[PDB]
Structure 1
Amino acid sequence: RSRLIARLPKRGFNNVGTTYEVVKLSQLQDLEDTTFDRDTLEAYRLVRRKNRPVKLLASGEISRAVTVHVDAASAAAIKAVEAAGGRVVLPE
């Protein structure tokens, strides 16, 4: 700086703790065979990181009856998984 990066006003923070892997509705439902996801096959389902929790979020809208083991999910996602019929589970 004589200029324009300083003069720009921040503190903010950092943190960045737990952040989730995205598994779309449209991923499971609609396409493929219903590999019937749950706790392991998911790694071979082409959604792969670990080191993080997995979370299901609603994207695609179609009817299928499925069950899944994830670490957390979205309200509307549960709403649309049970309403096409199905189950979604959280750890105990």
Structure 2
Amino acid sequence: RSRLIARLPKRGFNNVGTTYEVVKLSQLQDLEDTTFDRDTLEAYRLVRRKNRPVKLLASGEISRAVTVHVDAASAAAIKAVEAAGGRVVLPE
């Protein structure tokens, strides 16, 4: 606590609330033949985590009509899926 450790001026504030699961756009699109996302059949899409919600993020740029059923999604992702055909459904 005196050799390069302490004497440093911080505090911040520790919280840690909700961590979402990144679902790379290229996972849905690109490959695969749309076997529906939903919330059970997507466990086999190498996105098995449990205990936390699911987030949709945009990384792969490719035109294809697919439908997405996650828990939350990003603006860009929504203006990316529908722009190519589909619908992102969020919990009520």
TM-score (norm 2): 0.93
Q: Does the CA-based 8 Å contact 1:38-1:67 persist in structure 2?
A: no
Please give the alpha-carbon distance, in whole angstroms, between the structure 2 residues aligned to 1:33 and 1:80.
Answer: 18
Please give the alpha-carbon distance, in whole angstroms, between the structure 1 residues aligned to 2:2 and 2:77.
Answer: 51
**Structure 1: which 5+ runs fail to align?**
none
Please give the alpha-carbon distance, in whole angstroms, between the structure 1 residues aligned to 2:18 and 2:2.
Answer: 38
Count of paired positions: 92
Provide the identity percentage.
100
Q: CA deviation at 1:39?
A: 2.1
Deviations 1:41-91 (A, max 9, x none): 111111110100000000001111111211100000000000011100110
CA RMSD of aligned residues (A): 1.0
Q: CA deviation at 1:3?
A: 2.7
- Richer in strand (by share): 1
TM-score (norm 1): 0.93
Please give the alpha-carbon distance, in whole angstroms, between the structure 2 residues aligned to 1:11 and 1:44.
Answer: 42
**Structure 2: which 5+ runs fail to align?**
none
Q: CA deviation at 1:9?
A: 1.0
Q: CA deviation at 1:2?
A: 2.9
Please give the alpha-carbon distance, in whole angstroms, between the structure 2 residues aligned to 1:65 and 1:2.
Answer: 59
Please give the alpha-carbon distance, in whole angstroms, between the structure 1 residues aligned to 2:58 and 2:73.
Answer: 9
Please give the alpha-carbon distance, in whole angstroms, between the structure 2 residues aligned to 1:65 and 1:75.
Answer: 18
Please give the alpha-carbon distance, in whole angstroms, between the structure 2 residues aligned to 1:79 and 1:9.
Answer: 43
